[PDB]
Curated annotation (Swiss-Prot), chain D:
The chain holds residues 406 to 506 of 1407 of the full protein. Co-administration of salinamide and rifampicin or salinamide and myxopyronin suppresses the emergence of resistance to both antibiotics. This is DNA-directed RNA polymerase subunit beta'. The gene is rpoC. It comes from the Bacteria. Mg(2+) binds at D55, D57, D59. Belongs to the RNA polymerase beta' chain family. Acetylated on several lysine residues in the presence of glucose.
Curated annotation (Swiss-Prot), chain E:
It holds the Pfam family RNA_pol_Rpb6. It comes from the Bacteria. PANTHER family: DNA-DIRECTED RNA POLYMERASE SUBUNIT OMEGA. This is DNA-directed RNA polymerase subunit omega. One of its GO terms (molecular function) is DNA binding. Keywords: DNA-directed RNA polymerase, Nucleotidyltransferase, Transcription, Transferase. Signal peptide: none annotated.
UniProtKB/Swiss-Prot annotation, chain F:
The lineage of its organism: Bacteria, Pseudomonadati, Pseudomonadota, Gammaproteobacteria, Enterobacterales. This is DNA-directed RNA polymerase subunit beta'. Co-administration of salinamide and rifampicin or salinamide and myxopyronin suppresses the emergence of resistance to both antibiotics. Belongs to the RNA polymerase beta' chain family. The modification N6-acetyllysine is found at K161. The gene is rpoC. The RNAP catalytic core consists of 2 alpha, 1 beta, 1 beta' and 1 omega subunit. When a sigma factor is associated with the core the holoenzyme is formed, which can initiate transcription. The rRNA transcription and antitermination complex (rrnTAC) consists of RNAP, NusA, NusB, NusE (rpsJ), NusG, SubB, ribosomal protein S4, DNA and precursor rRNA; S4 is more flexible than other subunits.
Swiss-Prot record, chain H:
Acetylated on several lysine residues in the presence of glucose. The gene is rpoB. DNA-dependent RNA polymerase (RNAP) catalyzes the transcription of DNA into RNA using the four ribonucleoside triphosphates as substrates. Resistance to the antibiotics salinamide A, salinamide B, rifampicin, streptolydigin, CBR703, myxopyronin, and lipiarmycin can result from mutations in this protein. It comes from the Bacteria. This is DNA-directed RNA polymerase subunit beta. The chain holds residues 1095 to 1144 of 1342 of the full protein. Belongs to the RNA polymerase beta chain family. Co-administration of salinamide and rifampicin or salinamide and myxopyronin suppresses the emergence of resistance to both antibiotics. The RNAP catalytic core consists of 2 alpha, 1 beta, 1 beta' and 1 omega subunit. When a sigma factor is associated with the core the holoenzyme is formed, which can initiate transcription. The rRNA transcription and antitermination complex (rrnTAC) consists of RNAP, NusA, NusB, NusE (rpsJ), NusG, SubB, ribosomal protein S4, DNA and precursor rRNA; S4 is more flexible than other subunits. In pull-down experiments interacts with CedA.
Amino acid sequence: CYRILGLKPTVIFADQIMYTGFAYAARSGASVGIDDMVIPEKKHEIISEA
Amino acid sequence: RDGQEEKQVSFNSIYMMADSGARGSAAQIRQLAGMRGLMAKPDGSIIETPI
Amino acid sequence: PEAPHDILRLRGVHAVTRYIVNEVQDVYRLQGVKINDKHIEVIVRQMLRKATIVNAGSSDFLEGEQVEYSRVKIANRELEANGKVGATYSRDLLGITKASLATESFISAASFQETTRVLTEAAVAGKRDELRGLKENVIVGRLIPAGTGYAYHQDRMRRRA
Amino acid sequence: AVVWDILDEVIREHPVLLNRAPTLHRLGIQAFEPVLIEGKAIQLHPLVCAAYNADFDGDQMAVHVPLTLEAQLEARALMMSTNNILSPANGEPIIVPSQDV
Amino acid sequence: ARVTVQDAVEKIGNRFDLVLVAARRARQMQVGGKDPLVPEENDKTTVIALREIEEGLINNQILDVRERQEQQEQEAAEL
Amino acid sequence: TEDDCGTHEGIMMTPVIEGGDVKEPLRDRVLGRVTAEDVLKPGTADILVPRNTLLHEQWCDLLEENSVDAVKVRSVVSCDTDFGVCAHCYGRDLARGHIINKGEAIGVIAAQSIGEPGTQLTMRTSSIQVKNKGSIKLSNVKSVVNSSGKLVITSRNTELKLIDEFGRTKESYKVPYGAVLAKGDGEQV
Amino acid sequence: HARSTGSYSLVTQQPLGGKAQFGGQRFGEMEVWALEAYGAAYTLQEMLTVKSDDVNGRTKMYKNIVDGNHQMEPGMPESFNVLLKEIRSLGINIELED
Amino acid sequence: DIVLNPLGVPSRMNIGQILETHLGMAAKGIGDKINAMLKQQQEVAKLREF
DNA sequence: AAGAGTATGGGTG
DNA sequence: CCCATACTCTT
Ligand SMILES: [Mg+2]
Ligand SMILES: [Zn+2]
């Protein structure tokens, strides 16, 4: 956008991008939990073979 | 939609955070969900038995 | 591992500056740091600011001294205009610590170097400071000869001479 | 009560300089237009933090006021955050979204 | 002119000269008691000068010509 | 402190390639610099990019279309200006995009640019196998066939290059003295 | 903490430091380098003289600001005079020319 | 009462806070059951059994 | 009688 | 830790 259009459109675009990203990150509801860290089932057998 | 089974990119939260570049990296995910690995003594030598 | 001085002596200025730029960029690239090559080139240009006369010719120089390259070039072109024969020289390469210690201003030198040595040497030599650099004008609270102040200083040069 | 309206009038188009120590690459000082807020903390735009290397866990900043017309015009035309979009070191943009965006 | 000065920079051709020309015009409007050449929209003298510059109404040559004309008129009207 | 010194000197810019891997493309090393020589087409004698041209994005795309692998550019080291430099030997102002203006303190900018990433640097402590299809080129080569049916090079500064279909050096290697070459110069591999 | 004007040191004639003394913020060498890299000469000169230790310049700037005239008349910092006196006290003749 | 950004967990690798949050939720749930039993006056036998 | 090498001191963080 | 200088053994 900066290389094709210029400076002012780039500033406007950056502000709009920030606003949209914040709004949809809030809307998604993305969280972190203990069940998100999935351990592979073959870890124990690899450790045993080593 | 036809009732079959398909494989797609995961919507896992940690995977989404790492894949988009928002936060984290491969090594940190490996520490979280896989073995941490070999550690070094203060001089610099590698301890034979890893974590 | 070859030395930069031999690279400059045998191959030339372009070879040594290419060598230094390549080494620094190789060091910086391992960490994923992006730096343009202009900046290293201006640092290297600041490093190459002394020349050793090998032959005096029709000049007022010796044959074993080390002096500013700009003064040598100006004297050479002036003598060539006057029809006489200029001097021949070989470029030098100095570290940044040594290069910055050869400034021609005692206020600027005393600002950051060891103050006692600089002040003693300047007092013994009876030096005179023209206040041409940025740091000197910062010390006495004037406009720096750069940016929006640059034109101002030109007017000074327009009125002094 | 009238001095608050006077203050709102006198800061309408007067830039200020924000600086965070240590200053490393000239992007540690930038110019902004003030918006008067309640409280005791300075609000910072999320897209400039990477230039300041700043985060909101205890960092502090200093604010300076230009006085003369030349200083105000230098702040507007040279140091304004909308002029410093590309990096002086490599030419890449510095106001890049991160994390939540 | 309120958010960016790109047009004024293009018109003048240099940021460092733009600052000086704008400062001269702003001091004329603030202390010299002259009137702006653009409709004042509740702006400070600096912003008014920048908007005049980006409109093609103010540059160094124009200021010099106006100054010489006013000096000549004052000299004529002195007697 | 000046606009143009008029010098014809410069330095050669080529892609940075280490071993069999390409590290730095040409476009990232000539974007924003002023050409010190006319950029001629590899096949013809026609002038593609004239003398003293500021290589912006369009010129870089044009150069990559014609597969140019070396360009001579102006640098501040070989500048004729005394007590400063000129705008054309410096080139583009990276923070803005146009050419540099007179009166800018480029030394402070360079020092800050080098020193700012200093906190990301740590403070405390026998064969050549070509990976890509192409042709074998030899520089400073002195080869002879021995009684054992081996093409041994008697030169100690031989450089082995992989030339692609576009005349580019895909890979570069150092050939030690006493090596046995499977194929000669100009042979496709 | 904020400050417009206040008390100054007796020797250097510069604003004091600390919130307890109602002091000002330090504008060190790195900030000067940043201003030099920007090219803002008038901002730097104003920061160096009429804001810290130009005794006549401070008063003139305050009067002009109250009168609505945003212009300065910089002079010599007092610290440079102190430095000249200190160097002269060491038996060395240092002086200004013309 | 508080909203915290989940983006601060994965790179810092301080997973103790997630487990503490889960265990505090469980403890508050037990307390809620006890409070509900106390509000509607019940026998001491049921309270001590629970 | 020069010339290369070693012990001592200054300024720096 | 790095560089400059007075004193000592060698060709
Ligand atoms: Mg912090
Ligand atoms: Zn030049």
